[PDB]
Amino acid sequence: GVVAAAEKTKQGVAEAAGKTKEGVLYVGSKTKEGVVHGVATVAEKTKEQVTNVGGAVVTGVTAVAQKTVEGAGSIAAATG
Amino acid sequence: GVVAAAEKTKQGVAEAAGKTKEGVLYVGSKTKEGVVHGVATVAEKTKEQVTNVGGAVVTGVTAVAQKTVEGAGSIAAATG
Amino acid sequence: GVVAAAEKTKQGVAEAAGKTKEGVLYVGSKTKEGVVHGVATVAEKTKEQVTNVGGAVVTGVTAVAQKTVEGAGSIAAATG
Amino acid sequence: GVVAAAEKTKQGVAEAAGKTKEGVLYVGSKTKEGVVHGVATVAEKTKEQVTNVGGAVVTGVTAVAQKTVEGAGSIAAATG
Amino acid sequence: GVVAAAEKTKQGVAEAAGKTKEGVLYVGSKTKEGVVHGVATVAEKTKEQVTNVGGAVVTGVTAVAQKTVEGAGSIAAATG
Amino acid sequence: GVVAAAEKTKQGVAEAAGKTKEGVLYVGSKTKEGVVHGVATVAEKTKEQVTNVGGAVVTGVTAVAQKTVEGAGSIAAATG
Amino acid sequence: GVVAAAEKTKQGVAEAAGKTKEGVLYVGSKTKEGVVHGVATVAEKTKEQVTNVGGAVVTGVTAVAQKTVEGAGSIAAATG
Amino acid sequence: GVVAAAEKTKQGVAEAAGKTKEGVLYVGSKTKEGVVHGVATVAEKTKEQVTNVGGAVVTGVTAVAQKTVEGAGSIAAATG
Amino acid sequence: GVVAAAEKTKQGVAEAAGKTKEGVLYVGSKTKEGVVHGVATVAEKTKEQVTNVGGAVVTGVTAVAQKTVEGAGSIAAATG
Amino acid sequence: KTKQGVAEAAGKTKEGVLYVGSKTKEGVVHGVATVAEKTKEQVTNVGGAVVTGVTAVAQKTVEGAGSIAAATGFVKKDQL
Amino acid sequence: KTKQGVAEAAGKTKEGVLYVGSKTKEGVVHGVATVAEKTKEQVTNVGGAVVTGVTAVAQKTVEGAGSIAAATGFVKKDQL
Amino acid sequence: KTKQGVAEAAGKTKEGVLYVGSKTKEGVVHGVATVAEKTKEQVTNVGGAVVTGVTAVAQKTVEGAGSIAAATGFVKKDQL
Amino acid sequence: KTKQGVAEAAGKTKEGVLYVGSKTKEGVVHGVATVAEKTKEQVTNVGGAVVTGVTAVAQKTVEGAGSIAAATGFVKKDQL
Amino acid sequence: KTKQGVAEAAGKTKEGVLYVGSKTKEGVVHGVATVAEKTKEQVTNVGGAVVTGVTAVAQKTVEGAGSIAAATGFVKKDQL
Amino acid sequence: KTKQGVAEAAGKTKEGVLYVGSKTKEGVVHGVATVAEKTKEQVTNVGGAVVTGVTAVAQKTVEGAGSIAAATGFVKKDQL
Amino acid sequence: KTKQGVAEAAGKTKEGVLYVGSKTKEGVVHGVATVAEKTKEQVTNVGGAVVTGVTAVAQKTVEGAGSIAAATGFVKKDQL
Amino acid sequence: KTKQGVAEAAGKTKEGVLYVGSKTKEGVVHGVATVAEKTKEQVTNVGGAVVTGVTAVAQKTVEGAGSIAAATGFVKKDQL
Amino acid sequence: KTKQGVAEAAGKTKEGVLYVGSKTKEGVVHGVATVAEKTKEQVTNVGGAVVTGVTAVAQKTVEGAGSIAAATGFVKKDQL
């Protein structure tokens, strides 16, 4: 039982609410989720080698922002 | 039982709400999910090699923003 | 039971709502999901080699923004 | 039971709503999903080689924005 | 049971709604899904080679915006 | 049961709606799905070679905006 | 049961609707699905070669906007 | 049961509708589906070669806007 | 059961509709489906060669707007 | 000498294709698109002006002191 | 000499493709798109001005002292 | 000499593709998009001005002392 | 000499692709997007000005002493 | 000499791709986006000015002594 | 000589890609986004000014002594 | 000589990619985002000024003695 | 000579990637974000000024003796 | 000579990546974020000034003797 009342008033406001659930709000904000910024490499000879024979390999520069709900959020998964 | 009332008022507002669920709102914000920004490479000889023989390989510069709901959110998956 | 009432008022507003669910709203915002920005490479000799023999390979510069619902959101999948 | 009422009012508004579900709305916003912006390469000799023998290979500059619902959202899939 | 009423009013509005589901709306917004913008390559000798023998290969500059519903949204698929 | 009523009013509007489902609407917006914009290549000798022997190959500059519903939305598919 | 009523009113409007489903509408908007814009190539010698022996090959500058409903939306398909 | 009524009104409108399904409408909009715009090539010697021996090859500058309903929407199909 | 009524009115309109399905309408809009616009080539020697031996080849500048309903919408098909 | 509102162009070439264009727009109204769907309008006017339609007016004048382009919806009762 | 509102261009080439363009817009209204769907409007006017429509006016004047482009929706009762 | 509001361009090339463009906009209104959906408006005016529509006015004047572009929705009762 | 509001460009090349552009905007209104959904407005005016619509005005003037661009929604009762 | 509000650019190259651009904006209003959803407004005006809409005004003037861009929502009752 | 508000750029290259840009903004309003959801406003005005909307004004003036950009919502009752 | 508010840039290269940019902002308002959700406002004004909306004003002036940008919400009753 | 408010840059390279940028901001308002949720405001004004909204003003002036940027919410009753 | 408010940069390299930047901010307001949630405000004003909103003002002046940036919420009753 929720009741609000206003009467005999020049400017009256009556506001009622049974159940309320506030939510997220960003005002003038900034965010950085999974960011790579400013990587420099000065070599003479570079060499990479990957010899995957049935798994999962993730190399190089990476930036991930997974947001899964009802499952594995792996980056490199390998099941058998 | 939710009740609001206004009467005998020059300017009256009555507002009622049983159940309310607020939601997300961005006002003047910025976001960065899965971003690669400013990568520099100054070499003389470069060499890459990938010899995948039945798996999953992900290389180079990468930027992912997966948002799955009811499944695996892998980047490199390898099942058998 | 949700009730709102206004009476004997010059300017009256009565507003009622049983159940309400607010939603997302962006006002003057910016977003960046899965972005690659500013990659520079100054070499003399470059060489890439991929010898996939039955899997999944993803190379080079990449920018993905998957939003799947009821399935795997892999980037490089390899099942057997 | 949702009721709104206005009476004996010069300017009256009565508004009722049983169930309401708000929706997404962008006002003056910008978005960037799966974007590659500003890639520069200054070499002398370049060489690429791909020798796929029955899988999936994705190379070069890529920008994807998959939005699948009831299926795998892979970029390079390889089943057998 | 949803009821709205206005009476004895110079300017009256009564509006009722059982169930309502709001929808997406863009007002003065911009979007970028799967975009490649500003790629420059200054070499002297370039060479590409692809020797696919029964799979799927996707190379070069790419920009995809798949929006499938009830099927795989791969970019390079290879089944057998 | 949805009811709206107006009476004894100089200007009255009564509007009722059982079930309503709003829809998408773009007002003064811009979109970019699957776009390649501003690619420059300054070489001296260029050479491409493709030797597909029974699969699917997609090369060069590409820009796709698939919107399938009940089928695979691949770019390069190869089944057997 | 949906009812709207107006009576004893100088200007009255009564509007009722059982079920309503709004639809898409673009007002003063612009779209770009599958677009290639501004590609420049300044070489001295160019050479392309394609030796397809029973698959599907798609090269050059491409811009596709497939919108299939009940079938594969591939760009290069190869079945056997 | 949908009912609207107006009576004892100088200007009355009664409008009823059982089921309604709105449709797409473009007002002052522009669209670009499958467009190639602004491709320039300044070489000295150019050479193309295609040696298809029983598949499908699509080269050169291309711009497609397929809208199939109950069939494959491939660009280069090759079945056997 | 859909009913509308007007009576005792100087200007009355009664309009009823059981089921309604709105349709597409373009007002002051422009469209571009499958368009090639502004291709320039400044070489000294050009040479093309096609040696199809039983498949389908499509080259040169192309602009297609297929709209099939119950069949494959390929550009280059090759069955056997 | 004096130049106002002048669009000028020039072009020289020895061999090749040439295009020169010069367009000028002064006092031009272009593209006024309007839709009214299922709209109710009720007007009662007594000795006044009511405007509800679409009015597109363009004017260009040289030596036009005291010019008026569009005077819409007004009541003028000057004594002198 | 004097230049106001001038768009000028020039171009020289010996061999190749050339494009020169010069456009000028002065006092131009472009692209006024408006939609009103299921809208109710009720106006009672007594000796005044009411404007509800769309008014797009463009004007260009040389030597236009005291110019007015659009005077919309006004009541003028000057004594002198 | 004097330059105001001037857009100027120039270009030289010996071999290749050339593009030169020069555009100028002065007193230009571009892109006014408006939607009103399920909106109720009720106006009672007695000897005044009410404006609710869309008014897009553009003006350019040379030697325009005392110029007015848009005077919308006003009541002028000057004695002299 | 004197330069105000001037956009100037230049470009030289011997071989290759060239682009030169120069744009100027002076007194320009671009992109005014507005939506009103399920909005109730009730106005009673007696000898005044009420403005609720959209007013986009752009003006450019040379030698414009005493210029006014947009005078919206006002009551002027000057004695002299 | 004198330079005010000038955007200038230059570029030289022997071989390769070149881009030169110069843009200027003076007195420009860009991107005014507004939404009002389920909003109630009630106004009673007696001899005054009420403004509730959207007013986007841009102005540029040379030699504009005493210029006014936008005078919105005011009551002027000067004696002299 | 004198430089005010000048954006200048220059660039030289022998071989490769070049980009030169110069932009200037003076008296510019960019990006005014506003939303009002489920908002109640009630105004009673008697001989005054009330402003509740959105007012975006931009102005640029040369030799503008005594300039005013935006005078919004005021009551002026000067004796002289 | 004299430099005020000048953005200048320069760049030299022999081989490779080059970018030169120069931007200037003077009297610029950028990004004013505002939201009002479920807000109640009640105003009673008698011969005064009330301001509740959004006012974004930008101004740039050369030789502007006595300039005013934004005078909002005021009551001026000067005797002389 | 004299330098005020100057942003200057320079860059030299023989081979590789180069970036040069120069930006200047003078009298600039950037990013004013505001939210009001479930807020009640009640104002009674009698011959005064009340300000509750958002006011973003930016100004730049050269030779501006006696300049005022923003005079908000004031009562001026000067005798002389 | 004289330098005030100057941002200067320089850079030299023979091979590799280079970045040069120079930014200047003078009289700049950046990032004013404000939230009011479930706030009650009640104001009664009689011949005064009340300010409750957000006021972001930025100003830059050269030769500005006697300049004022923001005069907010004041009562001025000077005799002379």
Residue numbers in the entry:
A (entry chain M), B (entry chain K), C (entry chain S), D (entry chain Q), E (entry chain W), F (entry chain U), ...: 14 to 93
J (entry chain P), K (entry chain Z), L (entry chain b), M (entry chain V), N (entry chain X), O (entry chain R), ...: 21 to 100
Quote the passages of the study that discuss this structure, keeping the authors' original sentences.
Multiple system atrophy (MSA) is a progressive neurodegenerative disease characterized by accumulation of α‐synuclein cross‐β amyloid filaments in the brain. Previous structural studies of these filaments by cryo‐electron microscopy (cryo‐EM) revealed three discrete folds distinct from α‐synuclein filaments associated with other neurodegenerative diseases. The 3.3‐Å resolution structure of the Type I2 filament reveals a fold consisting of two asymmetric protofilaments, one of which adopts a novel structure that is chimeric between two previously reported protofilaments. These results further define MSA‐specific folds of α‐synuclein filaments and have implications for designing MSA diagnostics and therapeutics.
Here, we use cryo‐EM to identify a novel, low‐populated MSA filament subtype (designated Type I2) in addition to a predominant class comprising MSA Type II2 filaments.
